[PDB]
Design a protein around this ligand. Structure first.
Ligand SMILES: *[C@@H]1O[C@H](CO)[C@@H](O[C@@H]2O[C@H](CO)[C@@H](O[C@@H]3O[C@H](CO[C@H]4O[C@H](CO)[C@@H](O)[C@H](O)[C@@H]4O)[C@@H](O)[C@H](O[C@H]4O[C@H](CO)[C@@H](O)[C@H](O)[C@@H]4O)[C@@H]3O)[C@H](O)[C@H]2NC(C)=O)[C@H](O)[C@H]1NC(C)=O
Ligand SMILES: *[C@@H]1O[C@H](CO)[C@@H](O[C@@H]2O[C@H](CO)[C@@H](O[C@@H]3O[C@H](CO[C@H]4O[C@H](CO)[C@@H](O)[C@H](O)[C@@H]4O)[C@@H](O)[C@H](O[C@H]4O[C@H](CO)[C@@H](O)[C@H](O)[C@@H]4O)[C@@H]3O)[C@H](O)[C@H]2NC(C)=O)[C@H](O)[C@H]1NC(C)=O
Ligand SMILES: *[C@@H]1O[C@H](CO)[C@@H](O[C@@H]2O[C@H](CO)[C@@H](O)[C@H](O)[C@H]2NC(C)=O)[C@H](O)[C@H]1NC(C)=O
Ligand SMILES: *[C@@H]1O[C@H](CO)[C@@H](O[C@@H]2O[C@H](CO)[C@@H](O)[C@H](O)[C@H]2NC(C)=O)[C@H](O)[C@H]1NC(C)=O
Ligand SMILES: *[C@@H]1O[C@H](CO)[C@@H](O)[C@H](O)[C@H]1NC(C)=O
Ligand SMILES: *[C@@H]1O[C@H](CO)[C@@H](O)[C@H](O)[C@H]1NC(C)=O
Ligand SMILES: *[C@@H]1O[C@H](CO)[C@@H](O)[C@H](O)[C@H]1NC(C)=O
Ligand SMILES: *[C@@H]1O[C@H](CO)[C@@H](O)[C@H](O)[C@H]1NC(C)=O
Lengths: 410, 409
C-alpha cells in the first residue's frame, strides 16, 4: 500500500528506488560524423605490433550512422552500440555535451563504456537550474596545472567537502575500448558516512541539468588516421529528488516529471510544504524523525494560516501556526473564541460549525446586549438573576415597567 | 437509441409498451376442487332441450386438476385451460381472489373468460399499498341497493370522477361457457380526453395489489354440484414509470422496478434522484416531460437540498442548493470564496484550488481581510494596490513597523 507510513501508519521515509538516471533520453551535442560523410581509422594490435583498419560514416547510412541513441539504448556486450563524433577534433575546442532534465536529481554511480580509448584531460559539469547557469563537478588530468591550473590528487578538506580533485590515475590506455570509469562522488568524503546529516553535501548532490565538455586527448607515434570520439553506452545512477516525500515521480499537466509529494509537502521536488501546512517549518523526513509538514488548527473555522519564526522559537520548538479569517463568528489562532457580538455555544463541540451564537440576552431583564462569551451570563441588572437575566431574585418582584422589572422586597 | 431521448437526444418521455401482466404469475386463493377430490356438474344446451353432464376434480390428478395456472397460461382457443373451484359453495361467502404485485401500474381494460356460466354477484378490490389496505370499484349485480347499498348505472360526475357506479350488464347466461366480460375504466368519464392533465384520473389508475370477491351464481333449473370456472386470464398494462423510464428492470433484491431515466428516482420514477432537486419532481406530460434536474454546485459539493419558495420566487425557474462546501468553496453553489481566501480571476471558476488567499501586507495592509472579490487589502492612509504594497501618489515610504507611507509636499 503506502511505504510513506510505518506499520502503524507512522510517517516514514518513502523513496524512489535506485535507477539509472540516463535511460532512453535525448542529449544535445556539438558535432558528429557523417555530415559531411566522414571517415575514421581504427588500429588493432596483435602480439607485438599493430594493424589499422579504417571506415566511413554516413548518418543517412543507418548501420554506418552512429547516433547517441547507441548510448541510451541497452548495452549488449555482444552487439555493441558505438556512437561516433566527427573526426579530427581536439584541444583547444569545447567537445561539449548538454543535458536539461527538468527535475532536480542526485547521482551515486557515474559509469561509462568505451568504443574509443580513454582521453587524458576532461572535466565534469552540472546545473542546478534548467540550462541557464552551469558549474563544474570534478577534474581529471595528468597536467592538472599547465592545462587546468590545478593540483594533482589534492585533499578533501572538511571545511570545503565540496573540493574538486584532479588526478592522472585511470586516465590510461589500455583501455583502448570498453574503458570503465566509475566515478563515485561518495569516495573520499570523511563525513560521507553520515550524509543524511550533510546538507552542504545534500546540496552537492543537487543537480538539474548536466553538461560535459572535452578538449584534450592522448597522442602516440610518431590523414593517415581519422581520429574521432566514440562511446558504446551510458549508465548513471540516482533517485528522484522528493526530499523523502514521494516513492516515485510522475508527469505534470504540462508534461513535466513531478513528485506526488507526500508528508504534507508540495512542489515538483517536495521542496515546499503543502498549502495550509504552515505550522512547523519545512524539513525533510528523517529515518529517526518524521519531519513531515503539518497543517494549522482552525477548529473547523478557517482554511488559511501563516507562520512567524518567534512563535516556533518561543514555543519551545513545538508549533507556530495561526489561522486567518475565522468563520462561524469565531476568532483566534485556532478560531477558538467568538468575537464581539456572539458567544460560545458551550453545548456544541469545541470545533462545531455553529459553536458561536449571538447573545440572546433579555432585552429588558439584561442590561446590555453582550453576554459573557465565556459563560453566557447576560448583563443582569441590580436585582436581576438568571443566565440570560430573565428571572427575578429572591425577594424581587417582576414589574410591568419596561425599564425596572425586578424590585427588592423588605 | 434510448427512447428516453429524442431524435436529437432530447430526454423525451419513454414508456414501457402495453403488455399482459398476469401471464405466468402465482396466486394464493381460498379453495378449489381437488381438496378433497370434488365433483361438479356441467349442463349443455343441445339446440333446444336440456342435457347436464357432471365431472370430478383431483388436484393430485394432473389432467383432472384445475390449477390457477389455467388462468395464467396462454389460452389456446382450441385447448382451453379451465380452472375450477370447489363446489357446494355460494353467497354468502367471500369467494375472494387476491394478488400482491410489488410494482405500481396503470391499467385501462379488464377482460374475463369462462368455462362455467357467468354468475350474478362479484366484486373488485385493489391496494395502492402492498396488500394491506383495500378499495373497490364499480359494481355488478341486479340489486345494487339491496346488496351493495348502491345505485344501478350511476352517472360519472366530473366533480367526482372517483364515482363508483353499479350495473347489471353482461351478467347473463348465455354465455353458460366462454363468457366474455370487457371493462373500460375511462368509459363514462367526461374528463378522460385529458388524462395527462387529469391527476385524479392519474390517481384513479393507481393500482398495486388487486383483490376480487365472488358470492352469487344463478340457479337456472333449479341435485347439482355448483361451482365457478374460467379458461384463462389476460391483463395488459405498462409499468408505472411516470413517463420517465422506458421499462422496469429487476432489482438486486428481486424487484421489477423502473430504470428511471430523465433524472427521476423511486421504483416508479415518482421522485427525483439524489442531487436531482433543482426543481421538484413532476410527471412527464404530453406537453412537457417535466423531468428532474440536478443541483448546481460548480464542482464544489457532494450533497444538496431545495426549497419551493426559491422556485416560487424564481418565477418558476430553479432552486437547487449545495451542502458541505469543501476545497476552499462556499455558497449556494459553493460558488464564492468564504470569509477567507479571494478570487484568483486567472484560474477557472471551479478549480479545486480556485480560491486564493488574501495575501494582505502584514504591515502595508491594515486588516487581514482583502476585498475577496477585488482582493483589495486594507491599504492604510497612503497605501494603494490590491494587497496594499505600494504607496499612493504623494506618499513617502518608511521602514516603520507601522506606518510606511508618509505624505509629501
Ligand atoms: C549516405 O549513406 C547512405 C547509405 O550508405 C546513402 O544512401 C543512399 O541514398 C540514396 C538516396 O538518393 C539511394 O540511392 C538509390 O540508388 C540510385 C542509383 O541511381 C539509379 O537510380 C535508379 C535505380 O534506383 C535508376 O533508374 C537510375 O537511372 C540510376 O541509375 C539513386 O539514383 C537513387 O537516389 C535518388 O533518390 C532520391 C530520393 O530518394 C532522389 O531525390 C534523387 O533523384 C536520387 O538520385 C536511389 O534512391 C540509396 O538509398 C542509397 N544509395 C547507396 C547506399 O548506394 C547515401 O547516398 C549517403 N549520402 C550521400 C550524400 O551519398
Ligand atoms: C388423484 O389423482 C391422481 C392422478 O390420477 C391419483 O394418483 C394415483 O397415484 C398413486 C400413487 O401411488 C398410484 O398408485 C399406483 O397403483 C398401485 C396399486 O397398488 C398395487 O401396487 C402394485 C402394482 O403397482 C402391486 O404389487 C400391489 O400389490 C398393489 O396391488 C399403488 O399401490 C402404487 O402406489 C404405491 O406407490 C407409492 C410410491 O409411488 C408407495 O409409496 C405406496 O406404497 C403406494 O401404495 C402405484 O403408484 C395410482 O396409479 C394413481 N391413480 C391414478 C393415476 O388414477 C390419485 O389416486 C387420485 N386420488 C385419489 C384419492 O384417487
Ligand atoms: C568554448 O568555451 C565556452 C564553453 O565551453 C564558450 O563560452 C563563450 O564565451 C564567450 C566569451 O565572450 C561568449 O561570448 C560566448 O557567448 C560563450 N558561449 C556560449 C555562452 O555558448 C565558447 O563559446 C566555446 N566556444 C565554442 C563552443 O566554439
Ligand atoms: C368476508 O368479508 C371480509 C373480507 O372480504 C372479512 O372482514 C373481516 O371483518 C372482521 C370484523 O370483526 C375482522 O375481524 C376480520 O379481520 C376481517 N377479515 C379480513 C379483513 O380479512 C370477513 O371476515 C370475510 N368473511 C370470511 C372470510 O368468512
Ligand atoms: C546487431 O544488431 C543490428 C540491428 O539490426 C544488426 O543489424 C546487426 O547485424 C547485429 N550484429 C550482428 C553481428 O549481427
Ligand atoms: C465569565 O464567567 C467566568 C466564570 O467564573 C468569570 O470568571 C469571568 O470573570 C466572567 N467574565 C468574563 C470572562 O468576561
Ligand atoms: C391440451 O393440452 C394438454 C397438455 O398436457 C393435453 O393433455 C390435452 O390432451 C390437450 N387437449 C386438447 C383438446 O388439445
Ligand atoms: C471592492 O472592490 C470594488 C471594485 O471597485 C469596489 O467598488 C468596492 O468598494 C470594494 N469594497 C467592498 C466591495 O467592500
Amino acid at each position: 500500500p503506502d511505504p510513506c507510513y510505518d506499520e502503524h501508519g507512522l510517517p516514514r521515509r518513502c523513496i524512489p528506488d535506485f535507477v539509472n538516471s540516463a535511460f532512453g533520453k535525448e542529449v544535445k551535442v556539438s558535432s558528429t560524423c557523417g555530415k559531411p560523410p566522414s571517415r575514421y581509422c581504427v588500429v588493432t594490435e596483435k602480439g607485438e605490433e599493430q594493424v589499422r583498419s579504417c571506415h566511413l560514416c554516413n548518418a543517412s547510412d543507418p548501420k554506418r550512422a552512429h547516433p547517441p541513441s547507441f548510448l541510451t539504448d541497452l548495452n549488449n556486450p555482444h552487439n555493441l552500440t558505438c556512437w561516433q563524433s566527427d573526426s579530427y577534433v581536439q584541444y583547444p575546442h569545447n567537445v561539449t555535451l548538454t543535458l536539461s532534465l527538468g527535475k532536480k536529481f542526485e547521482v551515486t554511480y557515474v559509469s561509462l563504456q568505451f568504443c574509443s580509448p580513454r582521453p587524458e584531460s576532461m572535466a565534469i559539469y552540472k546545473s542546478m537550474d534548467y540550462g541557464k547557469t552551469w558549474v563544474p563537478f570534478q577534474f581529471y588530468s595528468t597536467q592538472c596545472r599547465k592545462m587546468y591550473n590545478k593540483p594533482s590528487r589534492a585533499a578533501i578538506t572538511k571545511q570545503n567537502e565540496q573540493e574538486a580533485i584532479c588526478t592522472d590515475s585511470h586516465t590510461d590506455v589500455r583501455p583502448l575500448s570498453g574503458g570503465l570509469i566509475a566515478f563515485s562522488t561518495l569516495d573520499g568524503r570523511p563525513t560521507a558516512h553520515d550524509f543524511d546529516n550533510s546538507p552542504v553535501l545534500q546540496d552537492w548532490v543537487t543537480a538539474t541539468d548536466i553538461k560535459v565538455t572535452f578538449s584534450r586527448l592522448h597522442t602516440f607515434g610518431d590523414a593517415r588516421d581519422s581520429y574521432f570520439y566514440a562511446v558504446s553506452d551510458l549508465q548513471v545512477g540516482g533517485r528522484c529528488k522528493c526530499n523523502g516525500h514521494a516513492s516515485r515521480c510522475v508527469r505534470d499537466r504540462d508534461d513535466n516529471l513531478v513528485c506526488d509529494c507526500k508528508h504534507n509537502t508540495a512542489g515538483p521536488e517536495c521542496d515546499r510544504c503543502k498549502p495550509f501546512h504552515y505550522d512547523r517549518p519545512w524539513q525533510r523526513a528523517t529515518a529517526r524523525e518524521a519531519n513531515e509538514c503539518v497543517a494549522c488548527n482552525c477548529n473547523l473555522h478557517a482554511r488559511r494560516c501563516r507562520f512567524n519564526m518567534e512563535l516556533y522559537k518561543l514555543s519551545g520548538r513545538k508549533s507556530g501556526g495561526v489561522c486567518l479569517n475565522c468563520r462561524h463568528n469565531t476568532a483566534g489562532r485556532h478560531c477558538h473564541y467568538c468575537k464581539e457580538g456572539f458567544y460560545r455555544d458551550l453545548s456544541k463541540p469545541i470545533s462545531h460549525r455553529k459553536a458561536c451564537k449571538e447573545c440572546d440576552c433579555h432585552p429588558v431583564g439584561a442590561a446590555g446586549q453582550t453576554c459573557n462569551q465565556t459563560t453566557g451570563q447576560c448583563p443582569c441588572k441590580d436585582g436581576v438573576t438568571g443566565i440570560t437575566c430573565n428571572r427575578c431574585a429572591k425577594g424581587y418582584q417582576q414589574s410591568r415597567s419596561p425599564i425596572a422589572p425586578c424590585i427588592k422586597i423588605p
